[PDB]
Amino acid sequence: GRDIADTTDAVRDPQTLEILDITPCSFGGVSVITPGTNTSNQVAVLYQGVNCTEVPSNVFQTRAGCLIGAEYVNNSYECDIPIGAGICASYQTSQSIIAYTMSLGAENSVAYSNNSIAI
Amino acid sequence: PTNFTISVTTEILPVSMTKTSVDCTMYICGDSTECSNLLLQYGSFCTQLKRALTGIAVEQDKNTQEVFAQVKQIYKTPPIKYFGGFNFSQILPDPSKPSKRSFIEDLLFNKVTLICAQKFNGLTVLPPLLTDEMIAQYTSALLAGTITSGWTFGAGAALQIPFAMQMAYRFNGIGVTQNVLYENQKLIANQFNSAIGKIQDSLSALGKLQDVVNHNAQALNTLVKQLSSKFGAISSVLNDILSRLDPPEAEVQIDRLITGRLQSLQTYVTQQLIRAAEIRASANLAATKMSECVLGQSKRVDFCGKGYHLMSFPQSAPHGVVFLHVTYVPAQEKNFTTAPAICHDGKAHFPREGVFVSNGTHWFVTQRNFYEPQIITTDNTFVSGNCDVVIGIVNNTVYDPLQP
Amino acid sequence: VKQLSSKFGAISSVLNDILSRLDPPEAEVQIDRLITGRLQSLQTYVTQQLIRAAEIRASANLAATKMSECVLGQSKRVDFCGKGYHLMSFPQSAPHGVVFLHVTYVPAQEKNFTTAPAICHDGKAHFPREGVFVSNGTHWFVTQRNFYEPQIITTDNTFVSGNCDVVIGIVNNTVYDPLQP
Ligand SMILES: *[C@@H]1O[C@H](CO)[C@@H](O)[C@H](O)[C@H]1NC(C)=O
Ligand SMILES: *[C@@H]1O[C@H](CO)[C@@H](O)[C@H](O)[C@H]1NC(C)=O
Ligand SMILES: *[C@@H]1O[C@H](CO)[C@@H](O)[C@H](O)[C@H]1NC(C)=O
């Protein structure tokens, strides 16, 4: 059996005579998040596009793969180390590596009225 | 001209481009230690392509920031939604969606669009740093600042203003007096509403982003399909070579496959560099167009549309940006008799802000883009010289507004 | 420089260790490999140098345009010669580049006011020539757009077009005629 990429996708067993699909084993990229050698020595490891139930220190499942070694907070700060899909890493408590969603700015509402100007 | 037609056009420019990261060691060999040893004596060829593609990805992340991240604060619109009679409901986003994108956006993200086969050979597509929700929030903040402020929020703090006099200032910026807006406000609002309602039927062009997507998919499809080439070797798969020959006699076919796949990857890297140079030029043009048309009014001809430019509105698109250029197109022309100067009491008179026209019997001053005749008066005329030097100068009475 | 110490499938990396040890007509299959590898390295170097030269020619053209516009004049293009309302730019020479010192105008310290599009006086509307219509609570003034300077309502900075039945939001106020006798 062959797919559109002209490689082996399926096979037939010679004894039992049934078809068995062939799937490649899991693989991805390893990115190391470092706050700085002169600052500290503890790092974080980001796996690129790999589910967290395959990798053999807080586990986080993100759209940019599985992140190991960073703690999610529910606040929002500006981006320091961009990870991907709206998640940034930093170094605060300067004790541990934290992860968060980036903040695009403040929250401002211009006071529109029918008769109002500011000069 | 005696009348105008407010027209909303549509311009599409690509901004971003699909990031790819290629593991050059596994693309060529995959699991062969002998092929990995044979690749070691080729220098730093497998590192320069990785560095180049990393630069491509960082540049593609940088291209979005200059276009969309031009606001210090995320702006909001008060929920009354009455901007002088102008309808922005199709343009402003709705709260009844998880992504909070407008209709006009939702017609664009649906049009722009082999599964997992490229994953096995070592080709990974990195996600963008900014998701679609944050780009939509940036576009909504820019658009709300444009509605509530004008050009003031791009040069510092955001100063509040009514929309019906922001439109009067943008009318004054193209040479038309501001009484035209205050006396044809409902006509201009209805023309804008019809012109923005026709956009959905106009778009439902967008082939530039589709061409970008198709090129970036076809390059990866060719890179996958080039693995079947033998390049003079007896096989295209390394496991068939390694299970048949001793490494005394198997260092020729693997070498041929290595020189085939190295030149298959290097040309892909160079064409990606050239294509991202074009994408970076398009992103620079889009950032300049956003800064000059959205955060202000531009006097450059045919830069922010076709006509006398009033304002523009950004709309987010997949790997691009869409501008809605609002312009001033005149219509319903007439014919008049004109003169360069008026001779009265032996001295020439020239208009300080208008033209000299006649309908056949009487002479008046109008503007240059709109027909509004008025009585000849010393207030809109200045005196320079006598009626001897100018040619084509006609005689007419000039009224001074001082009776006693 | 570092690519000269590669093998490219040969048995050595320098020519003198092959031309003095290996056979004369059996070293032609490895000298060719070294020639092919070094030619490919030099061709790739020239290829990336051309693209970098184009990407720096674009920035040189951009720098020439802003030296023509911001330094040799005043530009009305938004965010081209700084961030704000542009006043000047001063060139400074730099290694392999140029540094511009963009002098811009940034306002501050705003106050809120009540606004009207026109003034209905004596049954006819009045519009400002180059100003606004603001009020601080009781009386109406004409200031500039970018600087608060309240001035007395006068015929000399207003023009009349039609009556006050077409404009919406128009308020009623007096207009001073600067003619006492
Ligand atoms: C794979 O990731 C998804 C996240 O979308 C989630 O279902 C889970 O973590 C993984 N799937 C399974 C079946 O474990
Ligand atoms: C402005 O006036 C209109 C009158 O039709 C009204 O509907 C609208 O609510 C007013 N705006 C605000 C912010 O109250
Ligand atoms: C256009 O305006 C009308 C009247 O105010 C109202 O239906 C709504 O605000 C808009 N309709 C649209 C966008 O379909």
Author numbering:
A (entry chain B): 566 to 621, 640 to 676, 689 to 714
B (entry chain C): 715 to 827, 849 to 939, 944 to 1143
C (entry chain B): 963 to 1143
The publication says:
Biophysical characterization of Omicron XBB.1.5 S(P2) demonstrated that it maintains a prefusion conformation and adopts a flexible, predominantly open, state, with high affinity for the human ACE-2 receptor. The findings reported here demonstrate that the monovalent Omicron XBB.1.5-adapted BNT162b2 vaccine encodes a prefusion stabilized S(P2) protein that tightly binds the ACE-2 receptor, maintains a relatively open and flexible conformation, and confers optimal immune responses against contemporaneous SARS-CoV-2 strains.
The structure of purified XBB.1.5 S(P2) was resolved by cryogenic electron microscopy (cryo-EM). This resolved structure of XBB.1.5 S(P2), therefore, closely resembles the more open form and flexibility of the S protein of earlier Omicron sublineages. C The overall structure of Omicron XBB.1.5 S(P2) trimer modeled based on the 2.98 Å density map. The XBB.1.5 S(P2) had a melting temperature (Tm) of 63.0 ± 0.2 °C, approximately 4 °C lower than the Tm of the WT S(P2) (n = 3). XBB.1.5 S(P2) bound to the human ACE-2 peptidase domain (ACE-2-PD) with an affinity (KD 4.84 nM) that was slightly less potent than that observed for WT S(P2) (KD 1.24 nM), primarily due to the faster binding off rate of XBB.1.5 S(P2).
